[PDB]
Amino acid sequence: ALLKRVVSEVVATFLLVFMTAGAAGISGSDLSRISQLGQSIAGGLIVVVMIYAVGHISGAHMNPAVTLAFAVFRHFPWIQVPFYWAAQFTGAIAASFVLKAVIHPVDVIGTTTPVGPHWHSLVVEVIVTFNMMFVTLAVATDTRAVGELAGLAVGSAVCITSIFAGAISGGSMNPARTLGPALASNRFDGLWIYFLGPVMGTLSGAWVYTFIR
Amino acid sequence: ALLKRVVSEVVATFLLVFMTAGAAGISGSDLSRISQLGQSIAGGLIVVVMIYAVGHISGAHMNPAVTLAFAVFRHFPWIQVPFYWAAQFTGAIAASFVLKAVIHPVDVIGTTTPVGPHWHSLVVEVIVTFNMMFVTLAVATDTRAVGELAGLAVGSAVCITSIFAGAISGGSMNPARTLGPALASNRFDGLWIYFLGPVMGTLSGAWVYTFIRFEDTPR
Amino acid sequence: ALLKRVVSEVVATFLLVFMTAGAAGISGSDLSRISQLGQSIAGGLIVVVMIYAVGHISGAHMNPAVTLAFAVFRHFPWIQVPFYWAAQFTGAIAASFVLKAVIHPVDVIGTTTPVGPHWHSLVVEVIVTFNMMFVTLAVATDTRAVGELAGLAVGSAVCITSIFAGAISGGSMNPARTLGPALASNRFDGLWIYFLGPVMGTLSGAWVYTFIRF
Amino acid sequence: ALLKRVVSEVVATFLLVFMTAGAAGISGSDLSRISQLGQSIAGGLIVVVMIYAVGHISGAHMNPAVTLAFAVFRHFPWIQVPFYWAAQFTGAIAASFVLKAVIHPVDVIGTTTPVGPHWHSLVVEVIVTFNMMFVTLAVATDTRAVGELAGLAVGSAVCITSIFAGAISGGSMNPARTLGPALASNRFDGLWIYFLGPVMGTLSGAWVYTFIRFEDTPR
Ligand SMILES: CCCCCCCCO[C@@H]1O[C@H](CO)[C@@H](O)[C@H](O)[C@H]1O
Ligand code: NA
Ligand code: NA
Ligand code: NA
Ligand code: NA
């Protein structure tokens, strides 16, 4: 079971970063090849796809901050958390180095970096990650919520992040989605934001939902 | 119960306004940062997200004119209306001022103000608000409707309003969503429209659905 | 009950046309106010909204050609068809003239008129209307289909029609949605296409679905 | 019952290619007529619509590589594979020539051809087709998946393909949807990629889903 969940998360996060960072990097190189809104939509839709494809096998976390929040609030076994982390970072990094080849001569592989003061990007990442984790705890753990629509709801949140936070921080919510492209592009500006921001956001969204449910 | 629902409404209206106004304001300052269509899609999607997040906790009104319409048509208890109201205005205002901090130097924080003669904005806000409350009453209160799709159905209305009414009134339907950004941006052009228009919209959309949901309608 | 269904259809069709022709007319006037894709998206979304609002009351036909095809294939009673037709045209025409006042000085109120040779628009209206009626009959009348997703499915078809057929015929599928704006705009080019194409479209789509269904 | 499924696949594949290649071709002639994003959305939405129309009839394959993968992994009878392939190629080519008539004087009919080095298009077609088939096998065959949402999930994969792979290979995943337009355009650049790529993509996607769907996978 653990092996199949690990493979599921490797593949789901690989596809998440491949489509998200691929569309972002091509768009950033030339808006006539992929529009800004088009790359934001693609980032939302790949989360929709992965949730309906493996949400019932691994839970489709694709995101180390999400796995952490689920474990902290007793929705997921702590013993599996390092494995999920190993899987998500592995898939994100593989995706990014595959892109670095197949979208060449584009050499900024859909990184998330801050526009403007870094603290803007800190606060925005926290809030938009909160929104995503808040709805995630509802649709993934509350029988009173509409679980069949989990994919649409979480993808919607990712799309929002991409449209709005994309203009400030690049709209990550996801240390692995950030770190892969950063390595493939050798671009690390503000990297710590994309670790601290999302963890704060996932832990607070979860906490607030756990209070109100 | 009540306090959880207040917290729900404050968080949901905050996140509604943060995303709606922040995307609309950044877009309004520079369309290469966020496209017009992008800021409208974000507006609809945040309402989808919040309905799937808290519809089963507080009803995810996130809008005082919706709360009012629900109470008037006996779907929501009057005693909690002020609490919901305070939550929504609180969240909206808090969000607008966090935006004012973090989208700086953008200074117009996604306001809704009239394009052209103000009665165009009044008529449009009533009708697009009617649309949103009409479908809301159906999906939230009618067992024959598809309650599981409430978020998608209401968000779709919100998206239409942002696309079409965005070009005339700014597409609010939501007195708190208008007022927060107004205070944060010191822009109040036509502000009364965004109270009267949505109230008339929700009351009338609720009234019409109430008339058609029953073959023999009471009263 | 017929009264409430007629009111349902007047309201739903008014709103379909108000949003669809409103967005199209403002976009046609100035793409910086509403984008081309934006107005297409609004056209699909209002059908989503109306199907979830009144599909369980009147069936959210909103379209005389759809009402007709439902009745021909015995899914809807013939005696209500004229009332549905009256409701639909009435709502469409009223919304169009409401638009004429509130989007002034825009004066083309979101019409659907052909681009290039008229017969292109005829064929395309037939085919895109087939697609919409085909999915409609599955989701509205086949218990093996996903009835809960009917609004999403039918609205999707409407959005495709706006995006693609919008470049050829204006993408109507809907005699009332075309006639309302035509009257409000005083523009009638190719009007007959938007009666005959959609009727052929809905009848043929319903025929083929009726043939393949189990 | 086979004739009904064959008619279902002719019609579904015809409408898939009619709307996908029609929008792509008009957009490729003139972005002011249909936007690039718009034609991408049309491509995803027609798959949504066809899955909800005929998923319960024929299974809404509309794609010979999908039929192939379903049959290899014992979800579809081998004996019907040639009938579905015949249906899909007939529907697709017929749609292409109808378009050639009604979008004239546009003469490139929504073709999928490589941008840049052809090997990129091979790799990308494999990966994006893998994504499509992976979710497909979940929602069409796994009782734990949300089958009612199959249309939306598969249409979403198609949309992503059109947006991202559209800038590299044209985003096909579908030998039929490539071949029809190529014949009608007299345009065959890198055609083999749209046979090999999608076949590799659906087989490996179906393989990896088969691997992960069971704790103890038979073999
Ligand atoms: C991952 C590497 C895959 C190897 C295949 C590379 C794709 C080459 O591409 C092919 O190159 C041929 C030249 O031999 C040309 O004749 C074809 O037109 C072209 O499509
Ligand atoms: Na539930
Ligand atoms: Na219901
Ligand atoms: Na059903
Ligand atoms: Na299921």
Minimum distance, in Å, between the CA of residue D139 and any CA atom of chain C: 14
Contacts 24+ apart (CB under 8 A), A70-74: A70/A140, A70/A206, A72/A203, A72/A206, A73/A137, A73/A206, A73/A207, A73/A210
Give the count of beta carbons closer than 10 Å to the beta carbon of residue C57.
24
Q: Which two tokens stand for residue D111?
A: 């073709």
**B219 part of a folded domain:** no
Residue C136 one-letter amino acid: T
The CATH number of whichever domain residue C87 belongs to comes to 1.20.1080.10
Following CA atoms A51, A53, A55, A58 in sequence, which dihedral angle do they give, to the nearest 10 degrees?
Answer: -120
A145 phi and psi angles, rounded to 5 deg: -80, 170
Which chains, if any, share at least 3 CB pairs under 8 A with chain A?
A: B, D
- Burial string for A25-39 (b: 16+ CB within 10 Å, else e) reads bbbbbeeebbbbbbb
Between CA C2 and CA C6 the distance in angstroms is 6
Q: How far is C157 from chain D (nearest CA, A)?
A: 6
Residue of D nearest to C125 (CA): D102
Measured CA distances, A115 to A170, A178, D15 (Å): 8, 15, 44
Beta-carbon separation of A145 and B22 below 8 A: no
Specify whether the CB–CB gap between B162 and B131 falls below 8 A. no
The structure tokens listed for B215 are 């073959």
> Using an 8 Å Cβ cutoff, are C122 and C197 in contact?
yes
Chain C nearest-CA residue for D42: C160
Residues in CB range of B119: below 8 A, 6 or more apart: none
What is the rounded (10 degree) CA torsion for B38, B43, B49, B55? -160
Length reported for chain A: 213
Domain hosting residue C77, numbered range: 1-212
Q: Do C61 and C9 form a contact (C-beta atoms < 8 A)?
A: yes
Dist CA A94 CA A110 (whole Å):
14
Secondary structure class of D214 (helix, strand, coil)? coil
Reported as half-sphere exposure (CB side, CA atoms, 13 A), residue C35 has a value of 22
CA B121-B127-B128 angle, to 5 degrees, is 85
Give the C-alpha separation, A191 to A179, whole Å.
Answer: 8
Nearest CA among D19, D35, D21 for reference residue D109: D21
Q: Is C37 within 8 Å of chain D by CB?
A: yes
Residue C199 Ramachandran class (φ > 0 left, ψ -120 to 50 alpha, else beta): alpha
User: What type of residue is B210?
Assistant: T
Phi, psi of A13 (to 5 degrees): -80, -40
Closest to A105 (Cα-Cα) out of D116, D190, D189 = D116
* B134: amino acid identity, one letter: F
Whether A146 and B32 have beta carbons less than 8 Å apart is answered as no
CA distances from D67 to A112, C28, C206, D64 (A): 39, 43, 26, 5
CA dihedral defined by B105, B108, B109, B113, rounded to 10 degrees?
Answer: -170
CA end-to-end span of chain D? 33
Q: How far apart are CA A195 and CA A213, in angstroms?
A: 27
Which residues hold their Cβ within 5 A of ligand 5, which is an ion?
A: D 147
Cβ contacts of A39 on chain B, cutoff 8 Å: none
CA–CA dist C133, D15 (Å, integer): 13
How many C-alpha atoms does A114 have within 13 Å on its Cβ side? 20
Helix/strand/coil (H/E/C) assignment for every residue in B141-152:
HCCCCCHHHHHH
Q: How was this structure determined?
A: X-ray
Q: Which ligand sits nearest to residue A140's alpha carbon? A: 2
Question: Can you give the C-alpha Rg of chain A in angstroms?
Answer: 16
Residue bearing tokens 């036909």: C61
Q: How many CB atoms lie within 10 A of CB A117?
A: 12
Cα B197 to chain center, whole Å?
Answer: 12
Q: Identify whether the C-beta of residue B111 lies closer than 8 Å to the C-beta of residue B182.
A: yes
Amino acid at C20: T
Do the Cβ atoms of C131 and D7 come within 8 Å? no
Residue whose C-alpha is closest to residue A45's, from A135, A158, A147: A158
Chain breaks in chain D (C to N over 2.5 A) after: none
| Enclosing H/E stretch for A21 | helix A2-29
Residue of chain A minimizing CA distance to B29: A167
Helix (DSSP H) and strand (DSSP E) numbers for chain D = 8, 0
Size of interface A-D (CB pairs under 8 A): 115
Compute the distance from residue B148 Cα to the ligand 2 centre, in Å.
9
Count the helix, strand and coil residues of chain B and give each as a percent rounded to the nearest 5.
Answer: 70, 0, 30
Give the number of other CB atoms < 10 A from CB of residue C49. 33
D114 lines ligand 1 (CB under 6 A): no
Place of tokens 């080095």: D117
Q: Distance between CA atoms of D117 and D163, rounded to whole angstroms?
A: 19
Please give the backbone phi and psi of residue C103, each rounded to the nearest 5 degrees, phi first: -100, 0
Taking phi over 0 as left and psi of -120 to 50 as alpha, with beta for the rest, C206 belongs to alpha
Number of domains in chain A: 1
Q: A48–D156: do the CB atoms touch at under 8 Å?
A: yes
Q: Which of residues 91-150 of D touch A (CB under 8 A)?
A: 115, 120, 123-124, 127-128, 130-131, 134-135, 138-139, 142, 144-146, 148-149
Contact C9, C66 (CB under 8 A): no
Distance CA C70, CA A37 (A): 38
3-class secondary structure per residue, chain A: CHHHHHHHHHHHHHHHHHHHHHHHHHHHHCCCCCCHHHHHHHHHHHHHHHHHHHCCCCCCCCCHHHHHHHHHCCCCCHHHHHHHHHHHHHHHHHHHHHHHHHCCCCCCCCCCCCCCCHHHHHHHHHHHHHHHHHHHHHHHHCCCCCHHHHHHHHHHHHHHHHHHHHHCCCCCCCHHHHHHHHHHHCCCCCCCHHHHHHHHHHHHHHHHHHHHC
Say how many C-beta atoms besides its own lie within 10 A of residue C79's C-beta. Answer: 9
Give the number of other CB atoms < 10 A from CB of residue B120: 19
Task: Determine whether D30 is exposed, middle or buried from the number of CB atoms within 10 Å of its CB (0-12, 13-18, 19+).
Answer: exposed
Angstrom resolution of this structure: 1.8
Q: What secondary structure does DSSP assign to B61-107, as a single string?
A: --SHHHHHHHHHTTSS-GGGHHHHHHHHHHHHHHHHHHHHHHSTT--
Residue recorded with tokens 């700014």: B170
Kindly provide the b/e burial profile for residues D200-209, where b requires at least 16 CB atoms within 10 angstroms of the residue's own CB: bbbbbbbbbb
Amino acid letter for position B47 = V
Cα A24 to Cα A13, B125, D191, distances in angstroms: 16, 36, 27
Within 10 angstroms of residue A4's Cβ, the number of other Cβ atoms is 18
Q: In angstroms, rounded to a whole number, what is the distance separating the alpha carbons of residues A203 and A105?
A: 39
Report the candidate in A93, A11, A151, A98 with the shortest Cα–Cα distance to residue D209.
A11
H helices of D55-172, where? Answer: 64-72, 81-102, 118-141, 150-164
E-strand stretches of chain C: none
Does the residue D31 lie in any domain? yes
**A13 alpha carbon – ligand 1 mean position (Å):** 29
